[PDB]
Design a protein around this ligand. Structure first.
Ligand SMILES: [Cl-]
Ligand SMILES: [Fe+3]
Lengths: 277, 6
């Protein structure tokens, strides 16, 4: 008894010994859940946050749910591999349980992230195939969306985060990966400048007009009207006056794994084409 | 990331 292990160089430069073929993965960091599920990995524990997604909840039925810090619950599932963010405060505790892969979220753009998960579980060929399909499809989608909204149309992305107005770059979820990378739509220029270093930013809500483009995607679907959509400033944005607001489901759009990506691809394409009428 | 979860 002794699963054969392979060396893996983590984001921090440290090498760790992980199973060549992991059988029981505890996915504490939920960014990585859908991508590992897509690759057929056996996940024995997953962060309860997946249950906020219209896409991922059904995909993890029967899988033990865990919240942040629950080392005991993770231990009980006897995992052979544990996935956490670099910002996780319980990393040493996880390490005493199973080889723990510590991912620095901002080190991987969304396609490289899925390639990274392919390396972890030894299924890079499956990633390649999926990626080629994704790119070809979203390339045609983006060309169609551009003809509908206009090649130079800018698109802003707004979200309420901890009771504050936030915006995002092209790889911090909220649909940004599909809007700005897969579709190739133009990001509103002040949004791009502000989010350029960090990938995300709080926006002073009285300055929202500064960051508002030809179209606005807001993660407010199914919610009461947020503070930032209720102002006279919001009412007088050209995008608002023109009927160019697209609303999306925040719990679902937070993610950027292959299942979520296919959903946001369809949903945004539909909403963007409608908003352009 | 710093100042938030990731
Ligand atoms: Cl992924
Ligand atoms: Fe976050």
């Amino acid at each position: 008894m002794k699963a054969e292990t392979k060396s893996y160089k983590m984001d921090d430069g440290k090498t760790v010994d992980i199973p060549k073929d992991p059988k029981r993965i505890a996915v504490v960091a939920p960014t990585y859940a859908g991508g590992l599920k897509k690759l057929g990995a056996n996940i024995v524990a997953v962060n309860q946050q997946v249950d906020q997604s219209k896409v991922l909840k059904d995909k993890f039925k029967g899988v033990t749910k865990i919240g942040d810090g629950d080392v005991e619950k993770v231990a009980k599932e006897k995992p052979d591999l544990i996935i956490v963010y670099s910002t996780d405060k319980d990393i040493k505790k996880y390490q005493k349980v199973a080889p723990t892969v510590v991912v620095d979220y901002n080190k991987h753009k969304y396609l490289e992230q899925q390639e990274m998960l392919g390396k972890i579980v030894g299924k890079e060929d499956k990633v390649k195939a999926w990626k080629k399909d994704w790119e070809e499809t979203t390339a045609k989608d983006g060309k169609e969306i551009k003809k509908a909204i206009g090649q130079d149309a800018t698109v802003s992305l707004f979200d309420e985060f901890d009771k504050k107005l936030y915006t995002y770059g092209d790889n911090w979820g909220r649909g940004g990966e599909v809007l700005y990378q897969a579709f190739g739509l133009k990001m509103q220029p002040e949004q791009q400048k502000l989010t350029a270093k960090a990938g995300w930013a709080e926006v002073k809500q009285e300055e929202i007009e500064k960051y508002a483009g030809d179209y606005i995607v807001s993660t407010s679907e199914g919610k009461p009207t947020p503070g930032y959509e209720s102002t006279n400033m919001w009412k007088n944005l050209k995008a608002t006056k023109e009927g160019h607001i697209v609303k999306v489901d925040a719990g679902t759009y937070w993610y950027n794994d292959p299942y979520t990506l296919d959903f946001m691809r369809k949903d945004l394409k539909e909403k963007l084409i409608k908003a352009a009428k | 990331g710093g100042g938030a979860a990731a």
